[PDB]
Subunit: 202 residues, 3 copies
């Protein structure tokens, strides 16, 4: 019926209810407050999606035990509707082809219609899936790739329970034994002046 | 216009329609039933989010070929609205800062406003992304980490196509050859009483 | 109040507004057009979920600066409601137990009520979490598994900064040195006719 621009004073994260304060002068009082006023939540059965509505947020109140109904507007004496900013959206928060979950232009999960899935942050850290690959991207200079039935890591030092592999692909176990630098002591021979080469390992 | 508390008898997962039974006595009949009554779904274009509305669920019916409309309330002669429980929510299902996808307080995907993304279950299994790291957490005693352009695994035995690395960082290929335990047979020498040390590998 | 079947001519991805064209003849003009007409978006606070509403899409218009309100129906002179297809849904897009995010029957994120999380595409690429495991599935013939405090890869050639491990578990560093094939040159001995075996590495 009638509505007003409003500021979120406080939120009840259990009741799915907010406390609101008019930001403009109404019609005695001037800045009316509204208590235990509910808002729409997304869910059904045991599942749900929660959005970070918090004190300081702007929106609009509309009007004329234990819950809780997911769509309370029209059937409650009043409800709160967030008026979120979208005008400055880039192709990353809003797309023509992708389903995009995002928070504060900082965290993303995008699902494209062709088999590409991307979970990432603006800092460059990425978990990516394409029709034929899974790739983990470390913006710090590392990349793990599963593709074509092969696995690859390209980046810096690899560490497996102490065992180490350099950025250039040399390895040394936890004990210091290096595959390319190690030597063997040989027993029971005559100190000579010749040099022979051993066989491959046993 | 008017509404009633209701129980989901059955669901039509194709039509997005439910069969409902009044849980209280109405106003002849007593417990009226409602058929092929629709509900709100989240989606647009090719994308969508499905919630597990199922038989046994509680909600409220409101009233006075092929679909399907995402918001049918107000424009259909009747629609179903789930009345899901939220009063017992912890900071994990509902937050002031995070976008949280969850199911049955068992499965989670949280997106924080600072670059942190967490996909996990209550059992402790975790896939985590921060502004500078990707971490895989095995509640069974293992952790894989990509950070600073380096990759690390700390936990138990690592197995790569038969090749094995112990929890303490010793390795042995599929053939039994251990980097730290292997020996070489040496040919063409005089059995003596001295002992020399070989060079590094070729 | 009154509504019409409609086609999306164009979309304003910044304003959350569409341009619509009636697909049937109205009541002068015949095929009326509607401009800067808004639609419902999912969000609250800094968070949101964007769906790929695009030109060509079908839906229904209902009727009688900078935004933007998440639920504009009933309080705007008109709004757009997508009429998405769901009749052909498989158990993968709609479930009785799982929360499912999907796009175009191509990309999926499913959250089950028992601790199972699945992120995958129809091509078979999978990232899976269960109560006791994390598994990465490469439909090309590879599988990475974290479970029981152990990590395993079974598939083809593993590549770590040049260092290689065959599908059968043999390894060779970037320099060509193979753990099972390498040999050592031995200095200062008498060329003989005997053969001794060295000790383990130093
Ligand atoms: Fe050797
Ligand atoms: K390094
Ligand atoms: K172990
Ligand atoms: K291969």
């Amino acid at each position: 019926h009638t509505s007003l621009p409003v500021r979120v004073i406080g939120v009840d994260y259990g009741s799915k209810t907010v406390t609101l304060e008019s930001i403009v002068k109404n019609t005695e009082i001037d800045y009316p407050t509204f208590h235990d006023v509910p808002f729409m939540v997304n869910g059904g059965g045991t599942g749900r999606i929660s959005f970070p509505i918090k004190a300081g947020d702007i929106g609009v109140v509309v009007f004329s035990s234990s819950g809780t109904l997911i769509q309370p507007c029209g059937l409650y004496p009043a409800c709160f509707i967030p008026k979120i900013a979208t005008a400055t959206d880039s192709s990353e928060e809003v797309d023509s082809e992708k389903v995009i979950i995002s928070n504060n232009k900082q965290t993303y999960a995008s699902f494209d219609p062709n088999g590409n899935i991307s979970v990432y942050n603006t800092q460059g850290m990425k978990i990516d899936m394409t029709p034929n690959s899974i790739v983990l991207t470390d913006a710090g200079g590392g990349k793990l790739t599963l593709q074509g039935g092969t696995m690859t890591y390209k980046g810096g030092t690899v560490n497996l329970n102490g065992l180490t592999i350099t950025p250039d692909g040399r390895m040394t176990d936890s004990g210091g034994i290096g595959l390319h630098t190690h030597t063997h002591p040989v027993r029971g021979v005559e100190t000579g002046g010749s040099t022979v080469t051993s066989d491959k390992p046993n």
